[PDB]
Amino acid sequence: MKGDKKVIQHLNKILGNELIAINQYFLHSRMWNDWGLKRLGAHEYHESIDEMKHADKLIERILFLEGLPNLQDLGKLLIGENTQAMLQCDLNLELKATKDLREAIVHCEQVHDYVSRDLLKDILESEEEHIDYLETQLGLIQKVGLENYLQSHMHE
Amino acid sequence: MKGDKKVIQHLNKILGNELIAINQYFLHSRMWNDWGLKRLGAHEYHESIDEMKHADKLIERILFLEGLPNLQDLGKLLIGENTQAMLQCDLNLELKATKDLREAIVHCEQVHDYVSRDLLKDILESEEEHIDYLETQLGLIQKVGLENYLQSHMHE
Amino acid sequence: MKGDKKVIQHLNKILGNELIAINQYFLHSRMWNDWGLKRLGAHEYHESIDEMKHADKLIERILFLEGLPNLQDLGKLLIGENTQAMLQCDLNLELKATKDLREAIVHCEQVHDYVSRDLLKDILESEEEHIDYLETQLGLIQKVGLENYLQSHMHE
Amino acid sequence: KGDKKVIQHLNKILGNELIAINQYFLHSRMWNDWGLKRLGAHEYHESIDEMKHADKLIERILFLEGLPNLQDLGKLLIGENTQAMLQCDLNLELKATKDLREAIVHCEQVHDYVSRDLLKDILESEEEHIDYLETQLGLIQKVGLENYLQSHMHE
Amino acid sequence: KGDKKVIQHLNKILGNELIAINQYFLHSRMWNDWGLKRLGAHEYHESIDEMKHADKLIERILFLEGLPNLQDLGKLLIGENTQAMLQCDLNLELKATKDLREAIVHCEQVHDYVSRDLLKDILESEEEHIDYLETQLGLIQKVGLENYLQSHMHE
Amino acid sequence: MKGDKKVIQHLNKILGNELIAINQYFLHSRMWNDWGLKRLGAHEYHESIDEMKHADKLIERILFLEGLPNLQDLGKLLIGENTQAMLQCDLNLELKATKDLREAIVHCEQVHDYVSRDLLKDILESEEEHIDYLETQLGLIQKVGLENYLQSHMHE
Amino acid sequence: MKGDKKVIQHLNKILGNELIAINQYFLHSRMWNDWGLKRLGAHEYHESIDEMKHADKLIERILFLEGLPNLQDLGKLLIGENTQAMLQCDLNLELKATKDLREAIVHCEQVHDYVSRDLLKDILESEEEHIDYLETQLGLIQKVGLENYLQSHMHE
Ligand code: HEM
């Protein structure tokens, strides 16, 4: 069902962010595991799985609108050096993702592509919930201190 | 356990191939669904999952060898435009991969990283079964015809 | 709840389109069943049932907004003479349905009937998925050939 | 001891079955290599069924103070494509039923009735396989090869 | 397409397995004929084991675009009696392991690591059988033939 | 089966590193239990059992190759005075056991004792996993603080 | 509880006899397995496990009493060359063990260490059961012949 060219472009833009998130979160998940912070590893792994399912729905929407999914042009992964930096990279990644999501919703509404708008809103509702985790985690590090925070995520 | 720099370099290259395969296999899977060849979409999606598991093991082995897993440098996806071509692309990708894996295995045996070798051997055994599948499909196209082949793949 | 007069007009129009698809899809299903293409007959029956369910929701919203649902006036059924013509008649009916669904959604927005917007967005999601199904059958008729496509739809 | 030429027959059949085992097993795996899994599955079972037949003959040969020969392996008729493989099977299957018919006759002359009834039940299995094989070749004509192969991709 | 001499080893290993399938199946049925059912049953499962090794080798050959050789049946080592039987199986198993070892080195050379792994797992399985055979022979020396045969009358 | 002489000399050397490990890990386990660190005790106990299980497999092999298992010689147990030292002591013992394990594999390969090489790769695999556990624990003391790290291993 | 310097000396002595039995009985078990005497190999395996459990209770007692367990100094494993000698090597080893257990029990009583006496007495009961096994087995070899006796221990 021929889609607007600019809708497919926003869609591929969102898709590209999800592909960054997939590789960033999956590497953070495995770094934390290597370090023995198994609870953070498991939680970051599910974030990456979530971004994958988001990617999948975007790929499907694009193909339906007779666009071409772009899985070739991987942007800049924000790999952090240690736990607090890893969280603060996920968060800045997520703040870029939510901005692009809103701009895409704005266009989808202009061109009346209301079903793609709903797909992006659902993805955005989930990214905001990730921001919440992130914000909450960074504030717990300040309240309980890094040594306690890290101890709490040793075990699952 | 500080491992050979060149072993890490090799593992990071195999990982690089798994990352290509993941995105290529996953796109072909969703293209095949878009076209209603739901049985190819199902097989290809499971070829994609399987390469994601391979990446997971390599990212873990690297991290144990105190290497830095490279998930940033994505190679050329080979995306076909029709079923015979999409299968052929995957078989091309798989052939550069089993080669890179034999090269990687040789070096592991020299520096005596026998555990890294065993993992690469296990991956290579996977990729050789994918090659079996792919060769077999393209042969089925000759033997039964492109139309029957596609027909045999509409329904799961 | 006294609801906007133009909102009710739009909803009745959408209901009118559902009432065509119900009858067009049902006759196509039975036509296909009489020709021995039971798999297409079962699919088209379920498309019909789905339009009935959409009709129910519109009928109920219209009554809540104190309008009068119009089940009296029945548009032109687009009946095909053969399988490929019937698929194309469904597709044409659906493209016009999503035209009107978008126009109706634009209005609900402007007059703040956000809940009526949401029902229509859900219907639109269903209808856009039917368009995907129809375009895919038509594409499969090309890839695998009419005779194979019909053979594939003999048994359930 | 038991009659001598009987043990010579049982050992001719046993040699047939040993040809069949290897031929059907190799065919079966060729079909799987090619992705024709339903033919593979069915040929594998013809292999298994011939192994069972060989088993029962070996047991009877020994009971007759005979010596089972498993060293003298005939010529296998290995086909290069599906229609050839079926015809090779059918050729082998027809020599094997002729040989079986000769053995059975010698059994009835020397009054070895239990060796006969064993050979009959084998010959019943081999006539079943001949029906299967004739049917398959007939279907290739009725539906065309490309279709006949499509119907044996999946199990 | 697989390396020329790899496929020749694989057919070599395959040929030894085909000798083992038959040798073990016949010993098995002689031990049963004699009433040594525990040895019969053990020797049957060694036969079945080699059939699985045969199968995995035919599938690998075909994958490599080679031609599996099931025609050329080598020399079967039969025994007149329990002690020769076990020693024949042991001699075959000793030719078998030498060849496997040779084949593995070629695979390692050309870099066919997957065919190596497969032969390694056959070897592992053949060393196991060698352990069983030496252990059995050991036990005839430790407990005496008449007893070791008593211990393998029943299952 | 008659086996090479310097192969058996190696297995008995690996075996000797296992016999040392059995005793060292069991004592570290029982010490941690007595200090109330029941989680370290439990884990070190299963490390001991694993070494017991490797030893049984090495003995099984030597007797098959008609060597003579050497359970009589027993090198120096490295018994730590504190948790960190006990971890380090295990870690030193493991790195030597892998140094020697590799040397055993090299020779096994060169004389075509391919089954014995497989056993040592497996042992080697299991030892590298213990290194990861050890490296990780020592790292975790840096990250969460020694007080938190011992606290975290009070309870099971 | 600060224990008596000589009680600890006695516990480490018994612990030494148990560390010998472990290794002697284990290797004896595997020897009997290699020769196909599975019943002997199994029963001997359990004797070995039994001693491992005795040794565990000792180390725990030593540590509770604030001594140092001695797992470093291993004595003379008595390895027979055949079934009949293996059984006698075992019998000779238990007889040295039950001497040392009685002297140790005398001393625990002299210093009012009733709990250590009970542990040791429990070990002593067990070793006396092993003696009755061994006495009965050697006597069985007499009444049936080494040939029948070994026949009777081929199968578990
Ligand atoms: C470095 C890249 C990736 C890695 C390491 C990775 C890893 C994984 C793993 C380990 C699993 C679960 C394994 C299992 O099912 O047993 C998984 C599931 C999945 N992956 Fe990936 N993945 C990657 C990239 C992607 C991409 C690019 C996509 C699609 C855009 C994707 C889509 C999915 C989906 C849809 C699932 C199933 C999720 C579910 O429903 O549970 N993955 N991935």
Ligand code: HEM
């Ligand atoms: C003299 C030749 C042979 C004899 C007497 C023989 C006998 C048997 C028997 C009685 C069975 C049990 C089947 C059942 O009752 O379900 C069997 C199974 C089997 N045979 Fe054979 N066989 C022979 C040769 C072969 C060969 C040459 C191959 C392969 C190259 C082979 C492959 C197999 C396989 C894969 C099985 C199934 C094993 C399992 O997974 O259970 N056999 N054989």
Ligand code: HEM
């Ligand atoms: C050459 C020395 C040893 C060998 C070959 C050996 C072997 C074994 C094996 C195979 C098991 C079975 C584990 C399982 O399957 O879960 C076991 C259990 C055990 N071992 Fe050892 N072991 C040795 C030394 C020791 C020592 C020195 C100790 C004590 C300091 C010990 C304490 C134990 C304990 C407590 C168990 C658990 C037994 C049970 O409760 O069932 N082992 N051993």
Ligand SMILES: [K+]
């Ligand atoms: K704390």
Ligand SMILES: [K+]
């Ligand atoms: K007896």
